[PDB]
mmCIF file of C-alpha atoms and ligand atoms in Angstrom:
data_model
loop_
_atom_site.group_PDB
_atom_site.id
_atom_site.type_symbol
_atom_site.label_atom_id
_atom_site.label_comp_id
_atom_site.label_asym_id
_atom_site.label_seq_id
_atom_site.Cartn_x
_atom_site.Cartn_y
_atom_site.Cartn_z
ATOM 1 C CA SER X 1 -67.041 182.219 159.002
ATOM 2 C CA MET X 2 -65.123 180.814 156.088
ATOM 3 C CA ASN X 3 -65.978 177.514 154.570
ATOM 4 C CA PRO X 4 -63.996 174.361 155.193
ATOM 5 C CA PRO X 5 -62.237 172.567 152.358
ATOM 6 C CA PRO X 6 -64.693 170.289 150.540
ATOM 7 C CA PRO X 7 -65.016 166.645 151.437
ATOM 8 C CA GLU X 8 -62.452 164.312 149.976
ATOM 9 C CA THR X 9 -63.441 162.620 146.701
ATOM 10 C CA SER X 10 -60.496 160.510 145.686
ATOM 11 C CA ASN X 11 -58.805 158.040 148.112
ATOM 12 C CA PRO X 12 -55.394 156.726 147.012
ATOM 13 C CA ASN X 13 -54.988 154.391 150.001
ATOM 14 C CA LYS X 14 -58.141 152.444 149.347
ATOM 15 C CA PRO X 15 -58.903 149.474 146.970
ATOM 16 C CA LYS X 16 -61.559 149.847 144.296
ATOM 17 C CA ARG X 17 -64.373 147.539 143.051
ATOM 18 C CA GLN X 18 -67.459 147.698 140.720
ATOM 19 C CA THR X 19 -70.550 146.213 142.232
ATOM 20 C CA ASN X 20 -74.049 146.071 140.936
ATOM 21 C CA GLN X 21 -75.162 148.206 143.944
ATOM 22 C CA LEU X 22 -72.581 150.920 143.159
ATOM 23 C CA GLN X 23 -73.520 150.921 139.491
ATOM 24 C CA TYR X 24 -77.183 151.465 140.512
ATOM 25 C CA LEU X 25 -76.194 154.207 142.990
ATOM 26 C CA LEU X 26 -74.571 156.282 140.259
ATOM 27 C CA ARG X 27 -76.664 155.385 137.171
ATOM 28 C CA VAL X 28 -80.054 155.400 138.778
ATOM 29 C CA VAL X 29 -79.977 157.083 142.156
ATOM 30 C CA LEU X 30 -77.564 159.947 141.744
ATOM 31 C CA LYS X 31 -78.428 160.581 138.123
ATOM 32 C CA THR X 32 -82.199 160.733 138.824
ATOM 33 C CA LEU X 33 -81.675 163.303 141.719
ATOM 34 C CA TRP X 34 -79.026 165.316 139.748
ATOM 35 C CA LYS X 35 -81.479 165.987 136.967
ATOM 36 C CA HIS X 36 -84.254 167.035 139.138
ATOM 37 C CA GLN X 37 -85.509 170.660 139.085
ATOM 38 C CA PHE X 38 -84.465 171.119 142.723
ATOM 39 C CA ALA X 39 -80.913 169.711 142.396
ATOM 40 C CA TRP X 40 -78.785 172.912 142.073
ATOM 41 C CA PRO X 41 -78.612 173.849 145.799
ATOM 42 C CA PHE X 42 -77.333 170.305 146.469
ATOM 43 C CA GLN X 43 -74.807 169.986 143.641
ATOM 44 C CA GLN X 44 -71.882 171.456 145.515
ATOM 45 C CA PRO X 45 -70.952 172.181 149.070
ATOM 46 C CA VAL X 46 -72.916 174.781 150.854
ATOM 47 C CA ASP X 47 -71.013 178.090 150.415
ATOM 48 C CA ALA X 48 -71.925 179.766 153.755
ATOM 49 C CA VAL X 49 -69.999 182.880 152.961
ATOM 50 C CA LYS X 50 -71.751 183.519 149.530
ATOM 51 C CA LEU X 51 -75.154 182.617 151.035
ATOM 52 C CA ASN X 52 -74.631 184.754 154.176
ATOM 53 C CA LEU X 53 -74.878 181.717 156.692
ATOM 54 C CA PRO X 54 -72.025 182.557 159.158
ATOM 55 C CA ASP X 55 -73.163 179.895 161.721
ATOM 56 C CA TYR X 56 -73.562 177.125 159.156
ATOM 57 C CA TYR X 57 -70.234 175.358 159.877
ATOM 58 C CA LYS X 58 -70.696 175.997 163.613
ATOM 59 C CA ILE X 59 -73.858 173.900 163.465
ATOM 60 C CA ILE X 60 -73.023 171.297 160.560
ATOM 61 C CA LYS X 61 -69.845 169.458 161.274
ATOM 62 C CA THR X 62 -70.367 166.686 158.690
ATOM 63 C CA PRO X 63 -71.214 168.621 155.414
ATOM 64 C CA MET X 64 -72.118 166.525 152.429
ATOM 65 C CA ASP X 65 -73.579 167.276 149.005
ATOM 66 C CA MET X 66 -74.421 165.546 145.698
ATOM 67 C CA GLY X 67 -71.427 166.989 143.811
ATOM 68 C CA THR X 68 -69.258 165.192 146.336
ATOM 69 C CA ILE X 69 -71.269 161.994 146.097
ATOM 70 C CA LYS X 70 -71.118 162.061 142.257
ATOM 71 C CA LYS X 71 -67.389 162.446 142.294
ATOM 72 C CA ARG X 72 -66.928 159.800 144.961
ATOM 73 C CA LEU X 73 -68.946 157.362 142.799
ATOM 74 C CA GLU X 74 -67.119 158.293 139.612
ATOM 75 C CA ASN X 75 -63.784 157.964 141.419
ATOM 76 C CA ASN X 76 -64.633 154.564 143.183
ATOM 77 C CA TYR X 77 -64.210 156.221 146.575
ATOM 78 C CA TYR X 78 -66.787 153.870 148.050
ATOM 79 C CA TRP X 79 -66.244 150.134 148.589
ATOM 80 C CA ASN X 80 -69.580 149.433 150.268
ATOM 81 C CA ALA X 81 -72.916 150.806 149.054
ATOM 82 C CA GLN X 82 -73.865 151.750 152.604
ATOM 83 C CA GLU X 83 -71.161 154.420 152.556
ATOM 84 C CA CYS X 84 -72.872 156.213 149.722
ATOM 85 C CA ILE X 85 -76.389 155.848 151.230
ATOM 86 C CA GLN X 86 -75.095 157.281 154.432
ATOM 87 C CA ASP X 87 -73.746 160.312 152.535
ATOM 88 C CA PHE X 88 -77.200 160.968 150.911
ATOM 89 C CA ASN X 89 -78.816 160.746 154.368
ATOM 90 C CA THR X 90 -76.291 163.123 155.916
ATOM 91 C CA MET X 91 -76.975 165.663 153.163
ATOM 92 C CA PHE X 92 -80.712 165.605 153.711
ATOM 93 C CA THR X 93 -80.376 165.629 157.552
ATOM 94 C CA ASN X 94 -77.986 168.636 157.544
ATOM 95 C CA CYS X 95 -80.613 170.650 155.538
ATOM 96 C CA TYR X 96 -83.370 169.748 158.103
ATOM 97 C CA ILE X 97 -81.050 170.690 161.067
ATOM 98 C CA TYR X 98 -80.017 174.039 159.731
ATOM 99 C CA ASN X 99 -83.344 175.229 158.238
ATOM 100 C CA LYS X 100 -86.893 175.462 159.456
ATOM 101 C CA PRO X 101 -90.145 173.713 158.538
ATOM 102 C CA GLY X 102 -91.754 175.501 155.782
ATOM 103 C CA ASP X 103 -88.511 176.953 154.380
ATOM 104 C CA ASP X 104 -88.425 176.422 150.550
ATOM 105 C CA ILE X 105 -85.145 174.551 150.823
ATOM 106 C CA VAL X 106 -86.622 172.103 153.308
ATOM 107 C CA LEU X 107 -89.612 171.349 150.999
ATOM 108 C CA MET X 108 -87.035 170.861 148.180
ATOM 109 C CA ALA X 109 -84.894 168.468 150.257
ATOM 110 C CA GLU X 110 -88.060 166.556 151.351
ATOM 111 C CA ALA X 111 -89.079 166.071 147.671
ATOM 112 C CA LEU X 112 -85.543 164.909 146.679
ATOM 113 C CA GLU X 113 -85.419 162.484 149.700
ATOM 114 C CA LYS X 114 -88.787 160.976 148.759
ATOM 115 C CA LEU X 115 -87.363 160.334 145.261
ATOM 116 C CA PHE X 116 -84.205 158.887 146.771
ATOM 117 C CA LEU X 117 -86.261 156.449 148.788
ATOM 118 C CA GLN X 118 -88.311 155.473 145.780
ATOM 119 C CA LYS X 119 -85.076 154.597 143.890
ATOM 120 C CA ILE X 120 -83.261 152.983 146.819
ATOM 121 C CA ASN X 121 -86.264 150.593 147.158
ATOM 122 C CA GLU X 122 -85.005 148.890 143.970
ATOM 123 C CA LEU X 123 -81.322 148.753 144.886
ATOM 124 C CA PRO X 124 -80.027 145.334 143.888
ATOM 125 C CA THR X 125 -78.838 142.724 146.260
ATOM 126 C CA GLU X 126 -75.234 142.447 147.689
ATOM 127 C CA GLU X 127 -72.722 140.097 146.147
HETATM 128 C C1 LIG Z 201 -75.191 183.955 146.604
HETATM 129 O O1 LIG Z 201 -74.486 182.739 146.686
HETATM 130 C C2 LIG Z 201 -74.891 181.548 146.079
HETATM 131 C C3 LIG Z 201 -74.409 180.435 146.510
HETATM 132 C C4 LIG Z 201 -74.823 179.160 145.973
HETATM 133 C C5 LIG Z 201 -75.747 179.224 144.995
HETATM 134 C C6 LIG Z 201 -76.208 177.758 144.342
HETATM 135 C C7 LIG Z 201 -77.739 177.728 144.681
HETATM 136 C C8 LIG Z 201 -78.366 177.682 146.099
HETATM 137 N N1 LIG Z 201 -77.657 176.878 146.916
HETATM 138 C C9 LIG Z 201 -78.300 176.830 148.095
HETATM 139 C C10 LIG Z 201 -78.097 176.165 149.346
HETATM 140 C C11 LIG Z 201 -79.072 176.360 150.332
HETATM 141 C C12 LIG Z 201 -78.924 175.711 151.668
HETATM 142 C C13 LIG Z 201 -78.765 174.249 151.764
HETATM 143 C C14 LIG Z 201 -78.531 173.260 150.696
HETATM 144 N N2 LIG Z 201 -78.804 174.055 153.121
HETATM 145 O O2 LIG Z 201 -79.001 175.164 153.775
HETATM 146 C C15 LIG Z 201 -79.067 176.225 152.933
HETATM 147 C C16 LIG Z 201 -79.411 177.673 153.361
HETATM 148 C C17 LIG Z 201 -80.190 177.231 150.167
HETATM 149 C C18 LIG Z 201 -80.357 177.752 148.936
HETATM 150 C C19 LIG Z 201 -79.394 177.611 147.976
HETATM 151 N N3 LIG Z 201 -79.483 178.085 146.751
HETATM 152 C C20 LIG Z 201 -80.472 179.096 146.136
HETATM 153 C C21 LIG Z 201 -80.124 180.418 146.772
HETATM 154 N N4 LIG Z 201 -80.790 181.622 146.143
HETATM 155 C C22 LIG Z 201 -80.946 181.533 144.712
HETATM 156 C C23 LIG Z 201 -79.520 181.437 144.194
HETATM 157 O O3 LIG Z 201 -78.854 182.584 144.526
HETATM 158 C C24 LIG Z 201 -78.787 182.947 145.927
HETATM 159 C C25 LIG Z 201 -80.155 182.893 146.484
HETATM 160 C C26 LIG Z 201 -76.339 180.345 144.531
HETATM 161 C C27 LIG Z 201 -75.876 181.549 145.081
#
């Protein structure tokens, strides 16, 4: 029940660009969630060994976390804004799959997702 390696965060065989959407995703979306009281469980990959979750990576085959997302944005790993939005959605969905309604972590994820949706509402337009 060991963990997999973390997701890749730096892509040498991909071109890089700054867009207004990617700027918003790091400076507004990621930074607003990262600073939230509830951010710590989501700031690095789930350590299923330390947390005593031996079936986690039997159930979750596309792990994702905000530490990964932050590094991806800082490293220009994403070309399209939708790649980053999908990673946030994957992170929340994984939490909902593994855990149960009423678990503290679920309530925490739901609060962070509401905040995500409030900030994504003001994502700027595509060039
Ligand atoms: C003992 O090993 C660890 C490993 C990581 C961390 C970072 C914080 C933390 N990361 C978490 C991820 C999850 C989680 C997610 C996310 N998805 O499914 C599960 C299940 C749940 C709770 C988490 N928590 C608080 C856990 N509590 C309070 C901290 O000490 C342990 C008990 C802390 C301790």
